Amino acid sequence: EKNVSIVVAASVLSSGIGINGQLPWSISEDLKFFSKITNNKCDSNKKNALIMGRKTWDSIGRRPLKNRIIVVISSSLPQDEADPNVVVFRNLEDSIENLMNDDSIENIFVCGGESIYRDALKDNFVDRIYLTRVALEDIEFDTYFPEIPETFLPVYMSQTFCTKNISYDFMIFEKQELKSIDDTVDLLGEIFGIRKMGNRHKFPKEEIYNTPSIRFGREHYEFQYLDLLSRVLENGAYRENRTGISTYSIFGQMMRFDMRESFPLLTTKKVAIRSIFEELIWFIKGDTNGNHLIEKKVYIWSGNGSKEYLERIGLGHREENDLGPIYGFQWRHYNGEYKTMHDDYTGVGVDQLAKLIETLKNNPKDRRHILTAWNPSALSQMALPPCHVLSQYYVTNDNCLSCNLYQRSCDLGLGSPFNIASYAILTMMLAQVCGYEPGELAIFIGDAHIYENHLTQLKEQLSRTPRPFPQLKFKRKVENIEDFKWEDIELIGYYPYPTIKMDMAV
Amino acid sequence: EKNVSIVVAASVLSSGIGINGQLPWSISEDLKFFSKITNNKCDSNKKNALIMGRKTWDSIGRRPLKNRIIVVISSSLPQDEADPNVVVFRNLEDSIENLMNDDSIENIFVCGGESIYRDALKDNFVDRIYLTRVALEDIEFDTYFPEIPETFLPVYMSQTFCTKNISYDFMIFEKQELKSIDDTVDLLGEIFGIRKMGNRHKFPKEEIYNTPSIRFGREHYEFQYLDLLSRVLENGAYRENRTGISTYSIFGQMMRFDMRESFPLLTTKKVAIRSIFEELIWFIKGDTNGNHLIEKKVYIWSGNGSKEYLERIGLGHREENDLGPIYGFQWRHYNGEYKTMHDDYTGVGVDQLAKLIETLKNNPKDRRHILTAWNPSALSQMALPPCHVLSQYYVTNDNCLSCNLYQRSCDLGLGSPFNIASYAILTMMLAQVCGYEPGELAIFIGDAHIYENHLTQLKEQLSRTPRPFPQLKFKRKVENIEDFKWEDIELIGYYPYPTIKMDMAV
Numbered sequence A, B: 001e002k003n004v005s006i007v008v009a010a011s012v013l014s015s016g017i018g019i020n021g022q023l024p025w026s027i028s029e030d031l032k033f034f035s036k037i038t039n040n041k042c043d044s045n046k047k048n049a050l051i052m053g054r055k056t057w058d059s060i061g062r063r064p065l066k067n068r069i070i071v072v073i074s075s076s077l078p079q080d081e082a083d084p085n086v087v088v089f090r091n092l093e094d095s096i097e098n099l100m101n102d103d104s105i106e107n108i109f110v111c112g113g114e115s116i117y118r119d120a121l122k123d124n125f126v127d128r129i130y131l132t133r134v135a136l137e138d139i140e141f142d143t144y145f146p147e148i149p150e151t152f153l154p155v156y157m158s159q160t161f162c163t164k165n166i167s168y169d170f171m172i173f174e175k176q177e178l179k180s181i182d183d184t185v186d187l188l189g190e191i192f193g194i195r196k197m198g199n200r201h202k203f204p205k206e207e208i209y210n211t212p213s214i215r216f217g218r219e220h221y222e223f224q225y226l227d228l229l230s231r232v233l234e235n236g237a238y239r240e241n242r243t244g245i246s247t248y249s250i251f252g253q254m255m256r257f258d259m260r261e262s263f264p265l266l267t268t269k270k271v272a273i274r275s276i277f278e279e280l281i282w283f284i285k286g287d288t289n290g291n292h293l294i295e296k297k298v299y300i301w302s303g304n305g306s307k308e309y310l311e312r313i314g315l316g317h318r319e320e321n322d323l324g325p326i327y328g329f330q331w332r333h334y335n336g337e338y339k340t341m342h343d344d345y346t347g348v349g350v351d352q353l354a355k356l357i358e359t360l361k362n363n364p365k366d367r368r369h370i371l372t373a374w375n376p377s378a379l380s381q382m383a384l385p386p387c388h389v390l391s392q393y394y395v396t397n398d399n400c401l402s403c404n405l406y407q408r409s410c411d412l413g414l415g416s417p418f419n420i421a422s423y424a425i426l427t428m429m430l431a432q433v434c435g436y437e438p439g440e441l442a443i444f445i446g447d448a449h450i451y452e453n454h455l456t457q458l459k460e461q462l463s464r465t466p467r468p469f470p471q472l473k474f475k476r477k478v479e480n481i482e483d484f485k486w487e488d489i490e491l492i493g494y495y496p497y498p499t500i501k502m503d504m505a506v
Ligand SMILES: NC(=O)C1=CN([C@@H]2O[C@H](COP(=O)(O)OP(=O)(O)OC[C@H]3O[C@@H](n4cnc5c(N)ncnc54)[C@H](OP(=O)(O)O)[C@@H]3O)[C@@H](O)[C@H]2O)C=CC1
Pocket: A007, A008, A009, A010, A016, A017, A018, A019, A020, A021, A022, A023, A052, A053, A054, A055, A056, A057, A059, A073, A074, A075, A076, A077, A090, A091, A092, A111, A112, A113, A114, A115, A116, A119, A143
């Protein structure tokens, strides 16, 4: 009685694993994973057995695998005894003889094609499933991985990796069949109420926790956002704000995202990446004209730039969509005397973005690569004070550019997915202009809140198991950061869940 | 064969537990802890046995404890059979009969005085130790808790609590006698090098981890600082900076501290709390004159305000200790035209601190309680750009004031302990002036680094097991935040380890 595990690499949506007798992709790291996961053993005097179908045995050149014993399922192959590393059985049930005897076999792995996978799950022989999810769907398949039965639950999901602009994940599925520290903390939590800080940061309940079966393997960095939703639903205080829509709010959170091997664009919901870019380049250019975004069919600033809203906050003198000195006016003309959105501000104010790029490549290890937008002298003129307030940038020893961002107020339903992708793109732009690679992205949040009209929507989003992040590459190398265009961005391998409509609070 | 645990409340340094036949303190929550920890059982048809000495039996009024059986050790007490909840034995060894039989007893607890504690550890009967560390030392004791033998290791340390301005902790000591997820992560860490973000955030080794035996019970919030040191020693990249002293640096960290039940003043090192306050009130008053701190025997700004340093950074025109527009000049006179440190700036610039206090009590649930010091128009005039760059404040539903702080660069050896206590005091000041209680303190750090001449010192600090945080209360209620004085601060229960000398990099 030992362990039996399935090893498979399937596509993310349709679970395709083969085409025309070979693999539909070439990922080197996945083959290394297959080697290390099938060679992983505890006894040096024992070997592992790899069960595979005959057609898979043909696709690997009919040659043995080092340090392992291959078990081929076939009705026609001669049961040869010359090769001790290759044995042939007539059916999958009889091949389960590494259990009954052969104590020199420690672990059993199922690697065969669709027929072997389907018959191993149907006859209930499989204990574990090692799945490599590949982000390739618009190609042709003829061999698929069968649907994972409900008796299996995921326990691990790795971060997204990249090979030749292809995103892929690693997951583990398991078949579902000291207390002294926990008890003491509970007793202290009964004596002290909310005086114990742990009771103010309660672990989210299972009903609001995305994919609860993954407890110790929440490596995929989309959980950094999803678990933040769960933490708010668990501890968020019902509070009113300047809008008529109340929120559930907590204070002091953070999220980490990798940018070396993937692009942190949420997969549990279709995110409007084009509107995100158009807003970012609108900041970079130094523009505060709200019409330029509406002319490009981007209406994210329409609510905070209407005639009724502007007059309500005391800016009735302002033109229709003139938002005032905001992001991109403190970036390029900090402390500049603002008149209207039509005047020429070239030369006035401090150009932080220019000096930032200049300092990033002339003094990389400097500890002052800071871009700020909080200007107390201009807040009264702003249609909306800065939410993403201050950002800092960091050049690693291996020439990577990381970014920290502090956000005073975070609309988790709408603003947060935009802010994650926006500053991810901006860090990539700064990396190309300064000659670096993307690093890490950390976002530190003040008032993290959820609007009460987003509860049904965000709970729906929490029911969706995350998918591997896509890749985002630039088609050309620009000479100035202001020259970026939407056509220069290529989004590779983005297969999200359907979009979720949520209303913005004005 | 069942479990035997010691329950004791001893002082932090001398381990005193009694005086004149009674306790040297009155902590209600500790008695509730004794009740819940000794009533904690799994079988409802069983009881717990509490072994105690005769003098302890006298101190509790010689009356039984609800739902439990008291075992008194005495050579003279009559072995009475009338009371089934109280039994008398002639020695501690014979009292260990709840093991040999009496299957109606589930757990055994040792609660007696010094004689019972010493004989229970000497004869090696104890499996677990529940210790309440009380921060009271300058009083008289006549009964002590014996030294914990080396066969025990701590596994849990709770946050610091407060009762009648007395700090206390809860600790658990233990006697020292799935893998599939860990193996897969290791294999992925061998295939991918530093492309896997987990390998850039390696868990600190045991040799640089403060109190390594506490794995799952690192609740004491001083670990938020100590573990940050360990994380830097493990992953810090050797980098040069504007000073001649290189650092080991990582990017993107955070620390949480409670301020409701304690004051986050580090105990693993004696921190100059007086210099911290004098610097904070120096900021609040709006002062930039470096001599006013030197006149009060505070020399933390002497290095960055010398004639040699000022001329080296291009400010030779400046007077000796004129630091320029820095903290407290952006706080009270933001965007004000700076001349010298002797001019009158009353009325010029934006007074953020005044408007902050005004907004905190007139609109508490506002999401814009922000105090910033990063002024790109004044950086060239500063002797040193702001390290603690921006802070945000938050009023909870139960009228508590929390604080978030973003710090671009963090000297973990010198600056970090000052910044933790400084903004903790400032949050308490703002709470009293606005009529709130202290809440939580979160510090988000950009470039967290350790100077290479602090390696020997900080490793010494990591060898010291933390002690409960002290309490800090104000002696009077001021009418203006500028009226605070050092005599108004009372530091209760601060018993730190000896101070550690570290040189500042100029
Ligand atoms: N992405 C991945 O992880 C993997 C992908 N693949 C891909 O899958 C494709 C091939 O797999 P697939 O088409 O499903 O073929 P298989 O690998 O499943 O092999 C099928 C053969 O196994 C024998 N066999 C299967 N079931 C039985 C049975 N119940 N009794 C007796 N013999 C049986 C038969 O051989 P016979 O006719 O001799 O009797 C059959 O022709 C290839 O493209 C390959 O690259 C393969 C492995 C892994």
